[PDB]
Scaffold this active site. Structure first.
Site, PDB file in Angstrom:
ATOM      1  N   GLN A  24     -64.370  78.132 -15.988  1.00  0.00           N
ATOM      2  CA  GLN A  24     -65.773  78.364 -15.292  1.00  0.00           C
ATOM      3  C   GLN A  24     -65.645  78.865 -13.860  1.00  0.00           C
ATOM      4  OE1 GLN A  24     -69.007  75.863 -16.330  1.00  0.00           O
ATOM      5  NE2 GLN A  24     -70.362  77.031 -14.931  1.00  0.00           N
ATOM      6  N   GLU A  67     -64.983  77.768 -23.392  1.00  0.00           N
ATOM      7  CA  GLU A  67     -66.404  77.803 -23.879  1.00  0.00           C
ATOM      8  C   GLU A  67     -67.032  79.224 -23.764  1.00  0.00           C
ATOM      9  OE1 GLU A  67     -64.863  75.767 -21.436  1.00  0.00           O
ATOM     10  OE2 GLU A  67     -66.407  75.163 -19.928  1.00  0.00           O
ATOM     11  N   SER A 127     -59.235  75.502 -11.465  1.00  0.00           N
ATOM     12  CA  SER A 127     -59.876  74.148 -10.904  1.00  0.00           C
ATOM     13  C   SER A 127     -58.875  73.069 -11.252  1.00  0.00           C
ATOM     14  CB  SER A 127     -61.358  74.028 -11.062  1.00  0.00           C
ATOM     15  OG  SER A 127     -61.624  73.872 -12.368  1.00  0.00           O
ATOM     16  N   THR A 131     -60.155  72.643 -19.261  1.00  0.00           N
ATOM     17  CA  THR A 131     -59.430  73.878 -19.575  1.00  0.00           C
ATOM     18  C   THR A 131     -58.671  74.226 -18.288  1.00  0.00           C
ATOM     19  OG1 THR A 131     -61.242  74.551 -21.040  1.00  0.00           O
ATOM     20  CG2 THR A 131     -60.006  76.332 -20.128  1.00  0.00           C
ATOM     21  N   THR A 182     -68.149  66.439  -9.164  1.00  0.00           N
ATOM     22  CA  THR A 182     -68.844  67.010 -10.357  1.00  0.00           C
ATOM     23  C   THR A 182     -68.306  66.196 -11.587  1.00  0.00           C
ATOM     24  OG1 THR A 182     -67.202  68.751 -10.928  1.00  0.00           O
ATOM     25  CG2 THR A 182     -69.100  69.264  -9.156  1.00  0.00           C
ATOM     26  N   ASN A 198     -64.696  72.250  -2.119  1.00  0.00           N
ATOM     27  CA  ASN A 198     -65.889  72.680  -1.819  1.00  0.00           C
ATOM     28  C   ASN A 198     -66.952  72.243  -0.850  1.00  0.00           C
ATOM     29  OD1 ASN A 198     -67.105  74.469  -4.955  1.00  0.00           O
ATOM     30  ND2 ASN A 198     -65.210  73.323  -4.945  1.00  0.00           N
ATOM     31  N   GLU A 258     -43.325  88.848   2.055  1.00  0.00           N
ATOM     32  CA  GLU A 258     -42.905  88.751   3.618  1.00  0.00           C
ATOM     33  C   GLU A 258     -43.589  87.539   4.031  1.00  0.00           C
ATOM     34  OE1 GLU A 258     -44.217  91.828   6.114  1.00  0.00           O
ATOM     35  OE2 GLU A 258     -43.013  93.478   5.159  1.00  0.00           O
TER      36      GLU A 258
HETATM   37  N1  GTP Z   1     -66.070  76.299  -6.122  1.00  0.00           N
HETATM   38  C1  GTP Z   1     -66.424  76.482  -7.229  1.00  0.00           C
HETATM   39  N2  GTP Z   1     -66.117  75.639  -8.302  1.00  0.00           N
HETATM   40  C2  GTP Z   1     -66.381  76.004  -9.372  1.00  0.00           C
HETATM   41  C3  GTP Z   1     -67.124  76.901  -9.875  1.00  0.00           C
HETATM   42  N3  GTP Z   1     -67.602  76.594 -11.224  1.00  0.00           N
HETATM   43  C4  GTP Z   1     -66.899  75.522 -11.754  1.00  0.00           C
HETATM   44  N4  GTP Z   1     -66.206  74.949 -10.503  1.00  0.00           N
HETATM   45  C5  GTP Z   1     -65.408  73.844 -10.754  1.00  0.00           C
HETATM   46  O1  GTP Z   1     -64.979  73.304 -11.896  1.00  0.00           O
HETATM   47  C6  GTP Z   1     -64.866  71.914 -12.054  1.00  0.00           C
HETATM   48  C7  GTP Z   1     -64.974  71.858 -13.670  1.00  0.00           C
HETATM   49  O2  GTP Z   1     -64.373  72.423 -14.532  1.00  0.00           O
HETATM   50  P1  GTP Z   1     -65.226  73.965 -14.837  1.00  0.00           P
HETATM   51  O3  GTP Z   1     -64.718  75.232 -14.234  1.00  0.00           O
HETATM   52  O4  GTP Z   1     -66.633  73.623 -14.715  1.00  0.00           O
HETATM   53  O5  GTP Z   1     -64.716  74.024 -16.458  1.00  0.00           O
HETATM   54  P2  GTP Z   1     -63.289  74.362 -17.024  1.00  0.00           P
HETATM   55  O6  GTP Z   1     -62.591  74.506 -15.694  1.00  0.00           O
HETATM   56  O7  GTP Z   1     -62.995  75.384 -18.074  1.00  0.00           O
HETATM   57  O8  GTP Z   1     -62.874  72.890 -17.779  1.00  0.00           O
HETATM   58  P3  GTP Z   1     -64.005  72.130 -19.080  1.00  0.00           P
HETATM   59  O9  GTP Z   1     -65.103  71.735 -18.338  1.00  0.00           O
HETATM   60  O10 GTP Z   1     -63.211  70.953 -19.591  1.00  0.00           O
HETATM   61  O11 GTP Z   1     -64.207  73.518 -19.861  1.00  0.00           O
HETATM   62  C8  GTP Z   1     -65.856  71.413 -11.256  1.00  0.00           C
HETATM   63  O12 GTP Z   1     -65.122  70.472 -10.465  1.00  0.00           O
HETATM   64  C9  GTP Z   1     -66.261  72.346 -10.147  1.00  0.00           C
HETATM   65  O13 GTP Z   1     -65.945  72.035  -9.101  1.00  0.00           O
HETATM   66  C10 GTP Z   1     -67.461  77.769  -8.857  1.00  0.00           C
HETATM   67  O14 GTP Z   1     -68.373  78.697  -9.384  1.00  0.00           O
HETATM   68  N5  GTP Z   1     -67.308  77.530  -7.663  1.00  0.00           N
HETATM   69 MG    MG Z   2     -65.728  73.773 -18.410  1.00  0.00          MG
END
Ligand code: GTP
Ligand code: MG
Ligand code: GTP
Ligand code: GDP
Ligand code: MG
Lengths: 431, 51, 37, 59, 433, 42, 431
Positions: free
Chosen positions: E11, E64, E133, E138, E172, E199, E247
């Site tokens: 995400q 998802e 992340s 995922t 989160t 963040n 570089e």
């Molecule tokens: N900086 C930033 N972090 C994000 C953003 N969207 C999700 N995250 C980070 O993503 C982490 C959680 O994973 P997600 O991206 O929500 O979902 P995923 O990586 O697909 O993993 P799953 O939840 O198991 O499906 C959180 O700790 C958030 O910090 C975003 O738009 N900006």
């Molecule tokens: Mg997710």
């Protein structure tokens, strides 16, 4: 007759020669398209030194531009004199070196050394009596410091008798843009001592010093810097292209500048640089050229020559001067300063005169000098190279290229042996 | 060639460039103002629904 | 701005071109051949 | 939806930079797509004594 | 020509890719449809069709479906190739084990085939930009395995890494430290460079300098897009000192186990604040050294800089660059390791950064990006180690991963790996004086 | 005759400087930042 | 190039800053927006948008005093970051502003000081304004100087400080703050300009005919004092005098940096109608005890150093005549070891006037910086009042509860006891 093939290495090399070739075509009255509109019969009397004949009254570059990156060369073939070169002499690869000396010297260079060797052989056989080659490159990159060393070593075997110049850009410690700089520099000067007839040490920080103080330029680009090294190396072969009262060439200086084969590094400098507040309050004369030149602020190297001894000094003057005022000044600097000149060599000074004045000017002079202050650069570089290497920092980049570790050790050793024997010539009794 | 070979033109170009950048920033200021007005009216209408 | 001193082309400030058509090889042959008007 | 805000921008010229000078590949692209200079020819070159070529020496 | 491919995962990955690609389209001139209203500076990101169309080199992947269906519905519904946007029906739900062993392996092949096709379209490729992340199941596990397979698929090619690292205070998720511990072996032995960003630091920077209260993820995503634009600007547009990826890859990494630089952007100010501030090379480069502007909750003064890569952009002069570097070197609290007196890699670019409508950054004629490799980052891993140890002591949530079907000893193995890496950072920080 | 010639050369230098200053004025009056390409949506 | 930064502290500092910075904008012509429709470069600073930004740091522990500035006429003139506020104030407590509330915003200020300093190329010094009575003006200012002095070992730190009035007072616990702040103004100060509000009250009511004044009237005459000191740096004059010049020629011993200011002429316009003003007349009023800006009489002490600031249509010939007449008067005494004790600085631009002000437009003016030992009696009054209260340990639980040690009270009282003793020895005229 007496021809030069201008070898070009790196973004430094391409930009340096492009300004240089802009100067020389104006020196010979050549338009950006290639013909000759001039009214100087002596401009065409010796134009074959740098150019080659083409149909329709066209004259073409005898240059071979080399780089490892595609981005630099369209900048060349779009500029003030882009179209004067020809697309075949443009030789360059698909992958850069990333400032890694090993990549351009071993891994990526080997695929391209063939093609550049092909074209330079044809420029060599095109001329009847080739005097010798010429390269401008930097010791701070990946190609000029890298590939550039691999080019010279091959054509030394191919053409041993021919002279080989190099206007190598040496890095500055005060202003450096590269973390991996010392590794490339230490691995290149070891190639320079073995295979080079003639080298000039140009430092960018010195050019930044000369522009801020004497020129008082508010915002200098690299184009102003490129113009400096072009006018210098116009002043080296000026006697070759035009007649003079006392003529010379590169070989005339070459035998007269090298007491021993290990020493071919020199400190170029230019005489007539004045700011725009200085033009009104001046009276051009042979003394005023010698006053501006001998000032160690004026030198374009990165060391003060009062800390060493002058081994040999050259002064290639350009214009119309009386020679009694020429030789009396060269004797006068030897007599007054009784501590900065070596004693086992009396009459340290070589002087040459070319009648044709410089472009855009009435009087000028160019200087090539061998001093002991050149060792001030290396030992300061060795201060940094050893600091890198004692912890083996940044080594896996070079080690993964397929080289061993002893090549670093022999590089500094040969570099240490050079400055060691260089120090001895400073402290030597003549009698 | 003569375009390259002058510095005072670079000075004048920089001056006029920054001068026009100022007015473009003013346009951005008006943009931000209209965004704040939008969010304010959103809050007002939601208050009406609550009442 | 190193040389915005007045350009002052030397030879321009102060025939055989018709003979050799501004060609280097023709001029070399000419100067070997005299033929300079 | 907040995700819809990312692309809710009408094109207006003052969100754009003052100048625009990109990298133009009009010449070196052709020189890549074609083969580089190389000569596979037969050995051609005059015999030269450099300093003087072909005098008229005689008794 | 030099091309790069984006492999946004998770995400965070798809949101960041959305912000970055809106930035790219606005910069290079592409309509939301994909056409030019009016040289080939887009070739790094876009491919050009006979009809005049511009096609992305970006593979959005998620487990998802919804997070990609809003992309498929939004304004750029036609810009992006649908088979680039790859979805799964079910997701890991912050389970590294699920995203690594059960769920990823169904669509591993599909994602690999699509990235193979994109690399086929590319002629000479430069890098794979990974965006993910450390917390998500995922974006942790699926990302991990795609590095594992992509390493043997392309051994030599550069694999840049942009990742959200768990913040030291705010979180989160509760099960995030296990995923963050287990992912690090991938970014250790199968990554070329990493850009972990918390963040929390971006929140502080935004509410401090930008003076925007009540931020959201869009505000952070716009800054991350600005960072990536600054990284790729030397490649996309000309500069007197252009720096490609290799570089600055070379002039940042002293040893193969140390590929974790830290990012910094300046100037980042509101337009009203920029009204009364002259912005010069010295000011912007001094702002890039302040610990309050770092994008990671660590203080570089507690460590020592080993390397610094520098990217100016806009109307910048080498004289001012050298003067600024000289001042920085004269600075005393700004320390450097004993085996590096020369530690800067400077590259400059002409075109000033653009501005997105409705965003936050006012346009500034010159701008600075800094990539400083220092040894102060190890304390974040120390905090992660402490929290993960007090987690794993009582064996909480471990039943989830075990019932998923991975062995328990990998927890201890990853813990020991990260402890050894922290010790390596300490060894680097040691000076031989 | 020699000193007359040198004096006229000095006058020629002055005239060249005046001409270059005037063309400096003209290119000061000119105004453009196009760089052969405006942005594609402008 | 000459640059000064104002570090105004407290409710006094903000109110002083409102009058002083308004004077500078009118002096140079700065619009309330901040646009000129390089004499301004000592105070203002250029931006890209052609906007001039003051080099000031306004600090207050309560937001309301600065909030009037934030909504004032000069809202766009000041940069938002420069104005620093705080939620809670020291509330007439040195200890809160020194140990608990002072540390809360000591550091964020130092960030803003650095940024203003880095914008400047050559820094002359820091003009610092605060009060001895309020907790924020006394407590917070003490920490800042201690960190500033160790941060800037050489840059000047002048002091215009509100001293408590001998009779009237706006606070009860004000002797405690006044005593214990004297450590900072001793080992972390370069000069001092203590002002009691009473001495301005009689001067205005006697000279300017305003029988019922306010602090804005008090603030404006303080502004003329600072302007006259800086006028030499801002504009050209026959004899320019900078900060380092008059610092050197006023301090005979490093523990003595407490002179007295005096501004002249200060007359209403209608009484200026009847008075022809010359160099002699104004310089006689600078020695009048009734026109003294501190409630003390120099006739009970002896001058050791007199610094003279002229400005306007002044002539060096008439300055010398005025000095000679001054020396020929037995009412004025001078110490034995200073036979020559004057320092004349001449400026050209006359002081401006403010609409709605009090002073008339006058062609010539004079500022006076006379060091005397008659300032010794002033702190003796403060010693008498502090000791008369500290014996009964009143209000002490407040300072103890903040966490400052009680022994610092006795040490503070002892330090001023040694201070007054030193000023007796200078008053002693030995053989
Ligand atoms: N900086 C930033 N972090 C994000 C953003 N969207 C999700 N995250 C980070 O993503 C982490 C959680 O994973 P997600 O991206 O929500 O979902 P995923 O990586 O697909 O993993 P799953 O939840 O198991 O499906 C959180 O700790 C958030 O910090 C975003 O738009 N900006
Ligand atoms: Mg997710
Ligand atoms: N002459 C003069 N004195 C002032 C002015 N403002 C405040 N003062 C003096 O300051 C003293 C009290 O301190 P304040 O400046 O009011 O407040 P502070 O310095 O911030 O300290 P706190 O009250 O603890 O917050 C009073 O005795 C006043 O005489 C002013 O504008 N002019
Ligand atoms: N003086 C000067 N130096 C230049 C110029 N262009 C490049 N350089 C120097 O060249 C170095 C980079 O060289 P690089 O392009 O990596 O060399 P390459 O690897 O052989 O292509 C920098 O440190 C610059 O200082 C120029 O126009 N003038
Ligand atoms: Mg107060």
């Amino acid at each position: 007759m007496r021809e030069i093939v201008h070898l070009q290495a790196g973004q430094c090399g391409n930009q340096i020669g492009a300004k240089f070739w802009e100067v020389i075509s104006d020196e010979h009255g050549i338009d950006p398209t290639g013909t000759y509109h001039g009214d100087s019969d002596l401009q065409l009397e010796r134009i074959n030194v740098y150019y080659n004949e083409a149909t329709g009254g066209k004259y073409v570059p005898r240059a071979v531009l080399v780089d490892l990156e595609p981005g630099t060369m369209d900048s060349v073939r779009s500029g003030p004199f882009g179209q004067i070169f020809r697309p075949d002499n443009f030789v360059f690869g698909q992958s850069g070196a990333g400032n890694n000396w090993a990549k351009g010297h071993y891994t990526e260079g080997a695929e391209l050394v063939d093609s550049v060797l092909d074209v330079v052989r044809k420029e060599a056989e095109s001329c009847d009596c080739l005097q010798g080659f010429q390269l401008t490159h930097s010791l701070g990159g990946g190609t000029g410091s890298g590939m550039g060393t691999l080019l010279i070593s091959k054509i030394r075997e191919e053409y041993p008798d021919r002279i080989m110049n190099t206007f190598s850009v040496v890095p500055s410690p005060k202003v450096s843009d590269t973390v991996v700089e010392p590794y490339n520099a230490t691995l290149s000067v070891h190639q320079l001592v073995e295979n080079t007839d003639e080298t000039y040490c140009i430092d960018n920080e010195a050019l930044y010093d000369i522009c801020f103080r004497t020129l008082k330029l508010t915002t200098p680009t690299y184009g102003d810097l490129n113009h400096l090294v072009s006018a210098t190396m116009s002043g080296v072969t000026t006697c070759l292209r035009f007649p003079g009262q006392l003529n010379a060439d590169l070989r005339k200086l070459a035998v007269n500048m090298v007491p021993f084969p290990r020493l071919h590094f020199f400190m170029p400098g230019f005489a007539p640089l004045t700011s725009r507040g200085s033009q009104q309050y001046r009276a051009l004369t042979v003394p005023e050229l010698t006053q501006q030149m001998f000032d160690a602020k004026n030198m374009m190297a990165a060391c003060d020559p009062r800390h060493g001894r002058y081994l040999t000094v050259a002064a290639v003057f350009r214009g119309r001067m009386s020679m009694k005022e020429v030789d009396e000044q060269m004797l006068n600097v030897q007599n007054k300063n009784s501590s900065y000149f070596v004693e086992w060599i009396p009459n340290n000074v070589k002087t040459a005169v070319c009648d044709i004045p410089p472009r855009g000017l009435k009087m000028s002079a160019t200087f090539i000098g061998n001093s002991t202050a050149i060792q001030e650069l290396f030992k300061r570089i060795s201060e940094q190279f050893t600091a890198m290497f004692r912890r083996k920092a940044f080594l896996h980049w070079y080690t993964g290229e397929g080289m061993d570790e002893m090549e670093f050790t022999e590089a500094e050793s040969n570099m240490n042996d050079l400055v060691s024997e260089y120090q001895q010539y400073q402290d030597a009794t003549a009698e | 060639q003569f375009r390259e070979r002058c510095e005072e033109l670079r000075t004048k170009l920089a001056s006029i460039h920054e001068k026009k950048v100022v007015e473009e920033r003013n346009a951005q200021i008006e943009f931000n103002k209209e965004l704040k007005r939008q969010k304010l009216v959103e809050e007002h209408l939601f208050a009406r629904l609550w009442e | 701005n190193l040389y915005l001193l007045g350009y002052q082309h030397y030879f321009q400030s102060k025939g055989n071109y018709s003979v050799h058509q501004n060609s280097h090889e023709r001029y070399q042959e000419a100067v070997r051949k005299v033929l300079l008007k | 939806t907040s995700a819809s805000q990312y692309g809710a921008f009408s094109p207006r010229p003052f969100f754009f930079p003052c100048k625009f000078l990109p990298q133009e590949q009009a010449f070196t692209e052709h020189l890549k797509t074609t083969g580089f200079y190389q000569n596979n020819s037969l050995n051609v070159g005059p015999d030269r004594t450099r300093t003087i070529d072909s005098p008229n020496y005689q008794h | 020509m030099r091309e790069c491919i984006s492999i946004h995962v998770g995400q965070a990955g798809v949101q960041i890719g959305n912000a970055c690609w809106e930035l790219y389209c606005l910069e290079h001139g592409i309509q939301p449809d994909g056409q030019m209203p009016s040289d080939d500076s887009f070739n790094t990101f876009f491919s050009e069709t006979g009809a005049g169309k511009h096609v992305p080199r970006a593979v959005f992947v998620d487990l998802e479906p919804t997070v990609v269906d809003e992309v498929r519905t939004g304004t750029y519904r036609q810009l992006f190739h649908p088979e680039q946007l790859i979805t799964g029906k079910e997701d890991a739900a912050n389970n590294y084990a699920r995203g690594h062993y059960t769920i990823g392996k169904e669509i591993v092949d599909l994602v690999l085939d699509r990235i193979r096709k994109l690399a086929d379209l590319c002629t000479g490729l430069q890098g794979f930009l990974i965006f993910h992340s450390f917390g998500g199941g995922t974006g942790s596990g699926f990302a991990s395995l795609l590095m594992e397979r992509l390493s043997v698929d392309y051994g030599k090619k550069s694999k840049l890494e942009f990742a959200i690292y768990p913040a030291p205070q705010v979180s989160t998720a509760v099960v995030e430290p296990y995923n963050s511990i287990l992912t690090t072996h991938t970014t250790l032995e199968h990554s070329d460079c990493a850009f972990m960003v918390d963040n929390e630091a971006i929140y502080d920077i935004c509410r401090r300098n930008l003076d925007i209260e009540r931020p959201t993820y869009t505000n952070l995503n716009r800054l991350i897009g600005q960072i990536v634009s600054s990284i790729t600007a030397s490649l996309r547009f000309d500069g007197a000192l252009n720096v490609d990826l290799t570089e600055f890859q070379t002039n940042l990494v002293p040893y193969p186990r140390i590929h974790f630089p830290l990012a910094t952007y300046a100037p980042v100010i509101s337009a009203e604040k920029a009204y009364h501030e002259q912005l010069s090379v010295a000011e912007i480069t001094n702002a890039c050294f302040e610990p309050a502007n770092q994008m990671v909750k660590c203080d570089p003064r507690h460590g020592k800089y080993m390397a610094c890569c520098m990217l100016y952009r806009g109307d910048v002069v080498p004289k001012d660059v050298n003067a600024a570097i000289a001042t920085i070197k004269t600075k005393r609290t700004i320390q450097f390791v004993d085996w590096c007196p020369t530690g800067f890699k400077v590259g400059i670019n002409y075109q000033p950064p653009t501005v997105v409508p409705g965003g936050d950054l006012a346009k500034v004629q010159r701008a600075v990006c800094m990539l400083s490799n220092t040894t102060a980052i190890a304390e974040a891993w120390a905090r992660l180690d402490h929290k993960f140890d007090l987690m794993y002591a009582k064996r909480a949530f471990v039943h989830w991963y075990v019932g998923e079907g991975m062995e328990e000893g990998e927890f201890s193995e990853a813990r020991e790996d990260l402890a050894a890496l922290e010790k390596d950072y300490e060894e680097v920080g040691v000076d031989s004086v | 005759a020699e000193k007359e010639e040198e004096r006229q050369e000095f006058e020629a230098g002055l005239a060249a400087n005046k001409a270059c200053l005037d063309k400096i004025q003209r290119i000061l009056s000119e105004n453009q930042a196009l760089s052969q390409n405006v942005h594609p949506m402008r």
